[PDB]
Every structure is written in C-alpha cells, then in structure tokens.
Design an enzyme around this catalytic site. Structure first.
Site, PDB file in Angstrom:
ATOM      1  N   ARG A 134       0.771  -1.078   0.014  1.00 23.65           N
ATOM      2  CA  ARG A 134      -0.313  -0.472   0.490  1.00 23.65           C
ATOM      3  C   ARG A 134       0.587   0.949   0.010  1.00 23.65           C
ATOM      4  O   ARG A 134       0.250   2.253  -0.555  1.00 23.65           O
ATOM      5  CB  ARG A 134      -1.145   0.658   1.413  1.00 23.65           C
ATOM      6  N   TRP A 166       1.924  -5.007  -8.929  1.00 27.28           N
ATOM      7  CA  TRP A 166       2.821  -5.986  -9.205  1.00 27.28           C
ATOM      8  C   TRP A 166       2.971  -7.250  -8.594  1.00 27.28           C
ATOM      9  O   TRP A 166       3.284  -6.775  -6.967  1.00 27.28           O
ATOM     10  CB  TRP A 166       4.475  -5.511  -9.469  1.00 27.28           C
TER      11      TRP A 166
HETATM   12  C1  HEM Z   1       1.429  -2.458  -6.543  1.00 22.27           C
HETATM   13  C2  HEM Z   1       1.904  -3.434  -5.874  1.00 22.27           C
HETATM   14  C3  HEM Z   1       1.641  -4.701  -4.647  1.00 22.27           C
HETATM   15  C4  HEM Z   1       1.758  -4.798  -4.661  1.00 22.27           C
HETATM   16  C5  HEM Z   1       3.265  -5.725  -4.530  1.00 22.27           C
HETATM   17  C6  HEM Z   1       0.851  -6.156  -3.641  1.00 22.27           C
HETATM   18  C7  HEM Z   1       0.765  -6.958  -2.491  1.00 22.27           C
HETATM   19  C8  HEM Z   1      -0.117  -7.477  -2.030  1.00 22.27           C
HETATM   20  C9  HEM Z   1       0.481  -9.251  -1.793  1.00 22.27           C
HETATM   21  C10 HEM Z   1       1.633 -10.090  -1.812  1.00 22.27           C
HETATM   22  C11 HEM Z   1      -0.915  -9.541  -0.906  1.00 22.27           C
HETATM   23  C12 HEM Z   1      -1.684 -11.027  -0.276  1.00 22.27           C
HETATM   24  C13 HEM Z   1      -2.073 -11.697  -1.717  1.00 22.27           C
HETATM   25  C14 HEM Z   1      -2.583 -13.291  -1.229  1.00 22.27           C
HETATM   26  O1  HEM Z   1      -1.516 -13.728  -0.356  1.00 22.27           O
HETATM   27  O2  HEM Z   1      -2.980 -13.883  -2.267  1.00 22.27           O
HETATM   28  C15 HEM Z   1      -2.124  -8.637  -1.320  1.00 22.27           C
HETATM   29  C16 HEM Z   1      -2.724  -8.313  -1.509  1.00 22.27           C
HETATM   30  C17 HEM Z   1      -3.612  -7.543  -1.297  1.00 22.27           C
HETATM   31  N1  HEM Z   1      -4.578  -6.307  -2.430  1.00 22.27           N
HETATM   32 FE1  HEM Z   1      -1.771  -5.592  -2.702  1.00 22.27          FE
HETATM   33  N2  HEM Z   1      -0.447  -5.658  -4.058  1.00 22.27           N
HETATM   34  C18 HEM Z   1      -0.087  -4.637  -5.236  1.00 22.27           C
HETATM   35  C19 HEM Z   1      -0.985  -3.498  -5.555  1.00 22.27           C
HETATM   36  C20 HEM Z   1      -2.551  -3.666  -5.745  1.00 22.27           C
HETATM   37  C21 HEM Z   1      -3.812  -3.071  -5.536  1.00 22.27           C
HETATM   38  C22 HEM Z   1      -3.525  -1.947  -6.783  1.00 22.27           C
HETATM   39  C23 HEM Z   1      -4.223  -2.873  -5.375  1.00 22.27           C
HETATM   40  C24 HEM Z   1      -6.208  -2.270  -5.595  1.00 22.27           C
HETATM   41  C25 HEM Z   1      -5.963  -0.879  -6.026  1.00 22.27           C
HETATM   42  C26 HEM Z   1      -4.814  -4.113  -3.702  1.00 22.27           C
HETATM   43  C27 HEM Z   1      -5.007  -4.120  -2.652  1.00 22.27           C
HETATM   44  C28 HEM Z   1      -5.454  -5.522  -2.510  1.00 22.27           C
HETATM   45  C29 HEM Z   1      -6.506  -6.108  -1.731  1.00 22.27           C
HETATM   46  C30 HEM Z   1      -7.572  -6.451  -1.954  1.00 22.27           C
HETATM   47  C31 HEM Z   1      -5.275  -7.795  -0.842  1.00 22.27           C
HETATM   48  C32 HEM Z   1      -6.024  -8.787  -0.415  1.00 22.27           C
HETATM   49  C33 HEM Z   1      -6.883  -9.610  -0.641  1.00 22.27           C
HETATM   50  C34 HEM Z   1      -7.426 -11.078  -0.347  1.00 22.27           C
HETATM   51  O3  HEM Z   1      -8.464 -10.574   0.265  1.00 22.27           O
HETATM   52  O4  HEM Z   1      -7.136 -12.105  -1.320  1.00 22.27           O
HETATM   53  N3  HEM Z   1      -3.355  -4.071  -4.058  1.00 22.27           N
HETATM   54  N4  HEM Z   1      -1.439  -7.314  -2.046  1.00 22.27           N
HETATM   55  C1  LIG Z   2      -3.384  -6.823  -6.985  1.00 24.20           C
HETATM   56  C2  LIG Z   2      -2.763  -7.336  -5.773  1.00 24.20           C
HETATM   57  C3  LIG Z   2      -0.599  -7.046  -6.421  1.00 24.20           C
HETATM   58  C4  LIG Z   2      -0.179  -8.895  -5.498  1.00 24.20           C
HETATM   59  N1  LIG Z   2       1.292  -8.500  -5.473  1.00 24.20           N
HETATM   60  N2  LIG Z   2      -0.983  -9.292  -5.810  1.00 24.20           N
HETATM   61  C5  LIG Z   2      -2.229  -9.863  -5.564  1.00 24.20           C
HETATM   62  C6  LIG Z   2      -2.498 -11.256  -5.113  1.00 24.20           C
HETATM   63  C7  LIG Z   2      -3.409 -12.424  -6.460  1.00 24.20           C
HETATM   64  C8  LIG Z   2      -3.414 -13.593  -6.501  1.00 24.20           C
HETATM   65  C9  LIG Z   2      -3.868 -13.886  -5.536  1.00 24.20           C
HETATM   66  C10 LIG Z   2      -4.143 -15.079  -5.379  1.00 24.20           C
HETATM   67  C11 LIG Z   2      -4.346 -15.751  -3.708  1.00 24.20           C
HETATM   68  C12 LIG Z   2      -5.873 -16.775  -4.188  1.00 24.20           C
HETATM   69  C13 LIG Z   2      -6.720 -16.749  -3.053  1.00 24.20           C
HETATM   70  N3  LIG Z   2      -5.632 -17.116  -1.559  1.00 24.20           N
HETATM   71  C14 LIG Z   2      -7.010 -16.707  -0.528  1.00 24.20           C
HETATM   72  C15 LIG Z   2      -5.595 -18.658  -0.768  1.00 24.20           C
HETATM   73  C16 LIG Z   2      -3.678 -15.868  -6.627  1.00 24.20           C
HETATM   74  F1  LIG Z   2      -4.556 -17.558  -6.227  1.00 24.20           F
HETATM   75  C17 LIG Z   2      -3.211 -15.779  -7.866  1.00 24.20           C
HETATM   76  F2  LIG Z   2      -2.929 -16.480  -8.613  1.00 24.20           F
HETATM   77  C18 LIG Z   2      -2.925 -14.770  -8.335  1.00 24.20           C
HETATM   78  F3  LIG Z   2      -2.846 -13.937  -9.142  1.00 24.20           F
HETATM   79  C19 LIG Z   2      -3.035  -9.120  -6.186  1.00 24.20           C
END
Ligand code: HEM
Ligand SMILES: Cc1cc(N)nc(CCc2cc(CCCN(C)C)c(F)c(F)c2F)c1
Ligand code: HEM
Ligand SMILES: Cc1cc(N)nc(CCc2cc(CCCN(C)C)c(F)c(F)c2F)c1
Ligand SMILES: C[C@H](O)[C@H](O)[C@H]1CNc2nc(N)[nH]c(=O)c2N1
Ligand SMILES: C[C@H](O)[C@H](O)[C@H]1CNc2nc(N)[nH]c(=O)c2N1
Ligand SMILES: [Zn+2]
Lengths: 416, 409
Positions: free
Chosen positions: A117, A286
């Site tokens: 964020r 990314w």
């Molecule tokens: C810009 C680079 C970004 C990085 C490096 C990043 C990193 C991450 C990572 C590592 C996660 C955990 C994903 C998982 O464990 O499945 C995550 C979750 C999340 N990101 Fe970010 N993110 C980025 C951009 C964004 C953007 C642009 C948005 C929204 C406009 C966003 C909203 C969210 C939300 C809502 C989650 C929770 C998703 C869920 O509950 O499954 N992210 N992010």
């Molecule tokens: C904006 C953003 C940036 C970032 N760096 N990462 C994510 C998450 C993306 C992602 C998340 C999952 C997790 C699925 C749900 N979980 C709880 C099991 C995937 F499987 C997947 F292929 C995948 F692209 C989103």
C-alpha cells in the site's frame, strides 16, 4: 472505546499511536471473548434501501470534501444536496469522476491485507461505467492488461464497471483473477496444471472452451454484463507477459519447465464507495516473489514442486529435521526473483516489500492517525521473523471505501 | 453460537463449542482486532465465584460433579475465603490446574504433551534459599541427562501483594549480556539490563559471550538474593553443522533447557507469581529468534560471510539461505548430543493432531495463530493453513510486571 491505541515494534522499540480506528465502520468478526484474526472469511435483490444509503453517501462525501480541504464549502453543501435528491428520486446516485478516483485509491489505502500500500496514491483508475455488454467488458479488460503490463514495467491500475442496481443486473468477472492457469483433473485422480482452478476450468469447458490440456494454459475470460449469462473471450496471448523460471547457479532448474505470468490482477472482489457497490472492479499491481515461489509453486495443493526440486538438489528427504523442504524453498524463491529481474519484469522481494510497508505504516500513523493492517496476511509465508513486519504490532479494522469479498457468481447466477 | 474453523489445505472443518465457556477478555472488539498485540490491556467477594467455577470444573473433570465430595469441597472453600480472605488448593487440584493452564495456553505449539507434566509443589517454601533448592531439583529432574521431561515448580500464592514470591530471571537459564565501551554488545543483548541488576547486586561477571546468569530469587516480598546454579546441572550443546566444517569455529552454543520463570499461574482466583515451568526446545526458537533476531545474537552476516554468499542485494535471499543452514546446525547438534529437540515440521504436525484431539474430546482448542506459526518457512507447515479461534480459558498463564519496576527495597 478509548481515543488512543498504542502499537509497539518489539525489535526497534518504536511506539505508534492510533486514532484512526475511531472511524472504523463495521465488523472484524472478533468480540470481547473471541478473536477471529486467522479466519479467512469472517440474497441478490438485497440492495441498499434509501434510508440505508443517505448516511453512507453523506459520510463518503464528507470525507471527500475534507480530503480536498473544502469541508463545509458551498460546493460541499451543494454536492450533499444533489446526492440527497438523486437518492430520493432514483433510490441511488452516481459518483463524479473525482469521487470515483478518490474512492478507489482509498479502498486500496484501506486494504488491511495488502503489504504493497505504499503505492496507493499512484493508481490508474479506468472508468468503465459506460459499459453495457460482455464484449465491451473484454475491450476494457484488454486495455487494462496492456496498460498495466507496460512491457514489463508494471503500473498499478483498476477498471470499474457499472455499480449494482437491483442485484439482478450485476456486472461480474467470473474469473477470480484476470490471468490464471487452467487445472485439469485426470480419471486417475492426478491433476494437470493448477489444481486450485479445476472447478473454474470445468465451468469454462462446459461454456464452450477448447482446452489445450497443458501445464500452463491461460484461462479464458468469463464475463457477465448487466446480469446476462457470462460469455467467453480468449485474452490475446501477446498481452500475457510470462517469465520462464531459471536459477543463477543450478543449470538444471530450467529443465523443470516452470514459468509464471507477470501480472497479478484480482477480479472477484467488490468495491464499496459511499454505499455504492461495484461488483466488477479488476485491479492489478505487481508481484512479491513469495506469492509465486512459496504459495503458487510450493503449496501442497498447488504446483507442489518441493519434492522434485529437492531431488535435483540431492538433499536427504528421509527426515524432516534435515530441513530439506526449507532448503529447496529458498532456492525456488531465488530463481523466481532472478528470472523476473533478468527479463525486466517488475517484482519485489519480501525483504524490500516489508521494509517499505513499515515506512508506509509509520507515515500513515503520523499523517493519517493510523493504518489498519492484518499481521496474518502482511507477514510473508517464508522467513517471517527476519522481515521487520514480524516484530510490528498491528491494529486491524475496516474503513470505507473498501474492497470486500462477494459470493462466487456461479453459485448465485440465474441462467437465462 | 457454534463456530467453524477450516483448514485450507486439507479442507477439514472443525466445530468449536468450547469458546462458549470463556470469560476473560481478548482485547479485541467488534470493530478492532488486537490479534498481533503482544500484551493487550482480590477480595472474598470476587474470589468465591472464580473458586467455585474452578472446583466445579475440577469435579466435572473427574465425573463427580454435584457429588458429596464436591458439595462439601465448595463449603470448605467458602468457609475458608471469608475467615482468611483466601483458600488453599488440594494437591490434586494444584496438579489439575497446572496441567490445564498449559492445556489452555493459546500461544504454545507444544500442548499435545499437556497431560504429561511433572508438578512440584513448593507451597511450603519461605526463603530464597528454599527457592534455590526447589529450582535446582526442578532443573535436575527436567534435564534428565538430555532426555528432557516437562515440569513446573509452584511457589506460595500471592496474599496481600506485599509478600510476593518472584523469580526475577525471565528464564531459569539465560546468557548474560554486556554493554561495551565502544558501543557494541557482548553476549545476549536482551539481558543487558538484567545482567546489570545482577552485577550491581554483587555478581562477578566472567564477561564472556555465553555466561550463564545467576538466579535472582525473591521470597515473601524481600529483597532478591543471588545464587549460582551448579554448572553440572546446566546442560549445553555446542552448535556445529553436518556439512560445513567451519561452523564449529563460530563458537556458538546454547542451553538445552527452556524454562519460563516470569509468568503468573492463575488457578481458581489464586495467583502463583513464581511458577517456573520447562519443556524442550523447538529448533526455530534458537536458530531463528535467539541467533538471528537483529536485537539478539544477530549472526546472519557472519554465517553468510563464511558461506561466501553475495550480500550486496536483498533479492539474493542471502539472509534466508544462511537462516536455513543455521537451523540445520541447531537440530543436528542437539540430535547428535541426544538432547531432546523438535523441528518445526514435526512440532506443527503434532499440533494439528492435538487440535483434532481437542475438538473431538473437548469441543475446541484456543490457539494464537500469530504465535503458533513458526518464525520461518510458515506456509510449508500445516498450521499456516489452519484457521484458529483464540479465547481465554482459565486456569491460565498470564504476564505480570517485571519485579524491578514494583519492588520496594
Ligand atoms: C502495487 C503493487 C502491489 C503489491 C506489491 C501488493 C502486494 C500484495 C500481496 C503480496 C498481497 C497478498 C496476496 C495473497 O496472499 O494472495 C496483497 C493483497 C491484496 N492487495 Fe495488494 N499489492 C499490490 C497492489 C494492489 C492494488 C493496486 C490493489 C487495489 C487497488 C491491492 C489490493 C489488495 C487487496 C484488496 C488484497 C487482499 C486480497 C485478498 O483478500 O485476497 N493491491 N497485496
Ligand atoms: C493486486 C495484487 C498484487 C499482488 N502482488 N498480489 C495479488 C494477489 C493476486 C493473486 C492471489 C491469489 C490467491 C488466491 C486466494 N488465496 C486466498 C488462496 C492467486 F491464487 C493468484 F493467482 C493471484 F494472482 C494482487
Ligand atoms: C514440552 C515441550 C514444549 C514445547 C516444544 C513448547 C513450545 C513452545 C514454543 C515454541 C513457544 C513459543 C515461545 C516463544 O516464541 O517465546 C511456547 C510458548 C509457551 N509455552 Fe510451550 N512448549 C513446551 C512446553 C510447555 C510447558 C511444559 C508449559 C507450561 C507448563 C508451556 C507453556 C507455554 C506458554 C504459557 C507459552 C506462552 C509464553 C508467552 O506468552 O511468552 N509450554 N511453547
Ligand atoms: C516451556 C517452554 C518451552 C519452549 N520450547 N520454549 C519456551 C520459551 C522459553 C523462552 C522464551 C524466550 C522469549 C523471551 C520473550 N520474547 C517475547 C522476546 C526466551 F528468550 C528464552 F530464552 C526462552 F527460553 C518455553
Ligand atoms: C488460515 C490462515 O488464515 C490462512 O492460511 C492465511 C494465512 N495468511 C495468509 N497471508 C496471505 N498473504 N495470503 C494467504 O492466503 C494467507 N492465508
Ligand atoms: C508483534 C508480534 O505480535 C510479535 O512480533 C510476535 C509475533 N509472533 C510471535 N510468535 C512467537 N512464537 N513468539 C514471539 O515472540 C512472537 N512475536
Ligand atoms: Zn481479534
């Protein structure tokens, strides 16, 4: 509740003070007697009523005019009044382009599970509220993918389709992410491709998709406009940037035939702004390397490559206490980061990302009065305690605008 | 309401009813979760209900709820609470309450062992010399020549708050830490302050990297007294590596006995402020936290140096690579010396099995995911994928103030 809550970093002794929690809007799932901090997920026509909507709209509009330093101004009062009349006569209202951008950026700023964020203010918002068909959704989504990919110099972006009205006309991306690999269950019980996607792949095949039945087949888009039955589109493959995974030392690592796509793009979440519900709002950033190297590749119910990697490293796999799994896990994540960097595709390692998040959280405490954060999600899935967020106390609460989970559309859709 | 917890790897769903029996607060609210906060924020009147509740569940645990023995025990306790402002536990009650404080410890991954706990009743102790004798016996019993045995020693309960028994050491066995003239730190930096309190009290420090601290023991509210644990009771392991010949040249060692001595044991409203308890180590406690925390021994830089790793950028993951090697060395070293130790894969696997047992026989298992998930290789252990409900059951172990912040000398 008290006005001031303190959080401590146990490694640096830095103490921060939170007042922003006083603006939290709804439920964590926790109570005085039970904590649900590790729980992942704590009717269609049930849309907001006029009496529910007025306060949610005023609250958001108030927040917007505060942000632009015009709270109480003539423009603020006129916007409030115009929103009131619009809700009163149509049971809903339309956001101005400025408010839509502000709300989307703040839903990201408020996402307690996101470690990325620090970038929240730099988000390209694509207004697709004029879309009416699934073909138009496809056009919008292709332009997003091309813009966000940027030949490997990735740029965060969101595309926002029309808000919900009566709940029978929802726009939905049925894909959970824009770019995912197919999974195919074989008659003998084994799985080919990504086992996490077997259900969605079977839906696509039923809907007409001809599967190549390979290990890394990009799934088609399944797009629902205005509550109609969803339609299939193939993403042009030149828009899907992929990275073959190689290792700086192990020549044999390329022989594993691994690759991954460049663009993480979530497409199944709901964006809530001022009480309005944007049920189709694909957003992308990314990758952090551990998302691929630890979860996608090494989760037992995903590609599950630890065994095969450990065999080629010639590790002792007879005991757990040799830590052969941990050894191979590190080498896999080295190869993922080395591959993305070699091809000049944006990616962040978990050390850099968590260090940036601590700096971001401290700035938000100072400038905003707090920063909601879910430790269970923020701490990376390997090497937890050698990153600074492990040692950082966090407070989790739900601010709006927000991204929310919503039901899978195949469970709720009424087929035409 | 019944609550479900899901494992996202196995799809196993368990149903929790046990949470309906807690009363102590978590610190969370409906609006704010404090799950990652480490330390969230009596008289005859408040004492009898807690006492009554505890006796109630004790006689319930032995299938004699509402029995004659149970009714007359409740009378016995009420009789004692107004006529002395407290009551004393039976031996059987003490043992049951200690075992269930461990069983209810949300942050302990080791609880599959909860019912094998040797309980030493030290409630007749009156001086710090007696505390020292009791603690030496504990150390000798629990160490058992490397075949470690879980144990707890319980000293007299709090009375008026002015006569507290306290072990001033946070753990029975720790290494000293010394602030250096140039600004660096020798030994364990987490114990610099406690070492200074010992030096100020007369302790002659060897000023080495691994100096076993003395016991600082306070009985009945008096000034604490220093004692040296006889060194033949202090089992140590020199850390070496199965592959890297040079690892032995780092000069690393650790002690075999983890023993927490600064917590408070609450049983039926009574407060046991001195109750050192001990088990055996999970390898990550030493090789991840003790050795690789930046504020602890902080050895990653040295190890990656001897491993000739490229340390100029973070994305080489040189820290993660050196971390795994250090933790291999710890496990190999204890195992080679036949000192009990559990790796984090085996430990977390046992904990899932323990969770299954507790949901089946008890209706739940309170568990703190933030503490249960190991500090390395999180998602390749099964607890990472396990949803856990956290709630506070009594008997319980609790935090208490550091003694040097309340003591009137
Ligand atoms: C810009 C680079 C970004 C990085 C490096 C990043 C990193 C991450 C990572 C590592 C996660 C955990 C994903 C998982 O464990 O499945 C995550 C979750 C999340 N990101 Fe970010 N993110 C980025 C951009 C964004 C953007 C642009 C948005 C929204 C406009 C966003 C909203 C969210 C939300 C809502 C989650 C929770 C998703 C869920 O509950 O499954 N992210 N992010
Ligand atoms: C904006 C953003 C940036 C970032 N760096 N990462 C994510 C998450 C993306 C992602 C998340 C999952 C997790 C699925 C749900 N979980 C709880 C099991 C995937 F499987 C997947 F292929 C995948 F692209 C989103
Ligand atoms: C027998 C083998 C045991 C193992 C493998 C084990 C493992 C662990 C580990 C790894 C922790 C986390 C410690 C930290 O991060 O500082 C912990 C915490 C804890 N253990 Fe266990 N433990 C064992 C025995 C016991 C016993 C015998 C008791 C009590 C009778 C106990 C009560 C606790 C408590 C209360 C905590 C929380 C401490 C705190 O809040 O700081 N454990 N245990
Ligand atoms: C019964 C038991 C079994 C086990 N396996 N482990 C422990 C934990 C012991 C311990 C804990 C810490 C942590 C100090 C406080 N933390 C929050 C900084 C130490 F430093 C230490 F030396 C030490 F022995 C206890
Ligand atoms: C049970 C537990 O909540 C679950 O496995 C969580 C843990 N933390 C996570 N953290 C991230 N970033 N992503 C996840 O999918 C999960 N899974
Ligand atoms: C802030 C956070 O609660 C703190 O760093 C915790 C995280 N999890 C932990 N888990 C264990 N087992 N031991 C610890 O000391 C900690 N520290
Ligand atoms: Zn909580």
């Amino acid at each position: 509740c008290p006005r001031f809550l303190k959080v401590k970093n146990w490694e640096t002794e830095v103490v921060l003070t939170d007042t922003l929690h006083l603006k939290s809007t709804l439920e964590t799932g926790c109570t005085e007697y039970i904590c649900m901090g590790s729980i992942m997920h704590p009717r269609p026509e049930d849309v907001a009523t006029k009496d529910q909507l007025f306060p949610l709209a005023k609250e958001f509009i108030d927040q917007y005019y505060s942000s632009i330093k015009r709270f109480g101004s003539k423009a603020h009062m006129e916007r409030l009044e115009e929103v009131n009349k619009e809700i009163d006569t149509t049971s809903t209202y339309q956001l101005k382009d400025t408010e839509l951008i502000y709300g989307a950026k703040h839903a990201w700023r408020n996402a307690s599970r996101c470690v990325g964020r620090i970038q929240w203010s730099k988000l390209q918002v694509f207004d697709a509220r004029d879309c009416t068909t699934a073909h138009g959704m496809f056009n919008y989504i292709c332009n997003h993918v091309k813009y966000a990919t940027n030949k490997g110099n990735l740029r965060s972006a969101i595309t926002i389709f029309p808000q919900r009205t009566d709940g029978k006309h929802d726009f939905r991306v049925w894909n959970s992410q824009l770019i995912r690999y197919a999974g195919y269950k074989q008659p003998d019980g084994s799985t080919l491709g990504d086992p996490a996607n077997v259900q969605f792949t079977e839906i696509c095949i039923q809907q007409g998709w001809k599967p190549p039945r390979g290990r890394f087949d990009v799934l088609p888009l399944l797009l629902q406009a205005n509550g109609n039955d969803p339609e299939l589109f193939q993403i042009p493959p030149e828009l899907v940037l992929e990275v073959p995974i190689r290792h700086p030392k192990f020549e044999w690592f390329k022989d594993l035939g691994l690759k991954w796509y460049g663009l993480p793009a979530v497409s199944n979440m709901l964006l809530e702004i001022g009480g309005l519900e944007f049920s189709a709002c694909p957003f992308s950033g990314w990758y952090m390397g551990t998302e691929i190297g630890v979860r996608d590749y090494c989760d037992n119910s995903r590609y599950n490559i630890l065994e095969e990697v450990a065999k080629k490293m010639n590790l002792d796999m007879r005991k757990t206490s040799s830590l052969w799994k941990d050894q191979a896990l590190v080498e896999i994540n080295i190869a993922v980061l080395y591959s993305f960097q070699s091809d000049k595709v944006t990616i962040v390692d978990h050390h850099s990302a968590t260090e940036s998040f601590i700096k971001h959280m401290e700035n938000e405490y100072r400038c905003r009065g707090g920063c909601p954060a879910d430790w269970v999600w923020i701490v990376p899935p390997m090497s937890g305690s050698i990153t600074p967020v492990f040692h950082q106390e966090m407070l989790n609460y739900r601010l709006t605008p927000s991204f929310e989970y919503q039901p899978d559309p195949w469970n709720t859709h009424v087929w035409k």
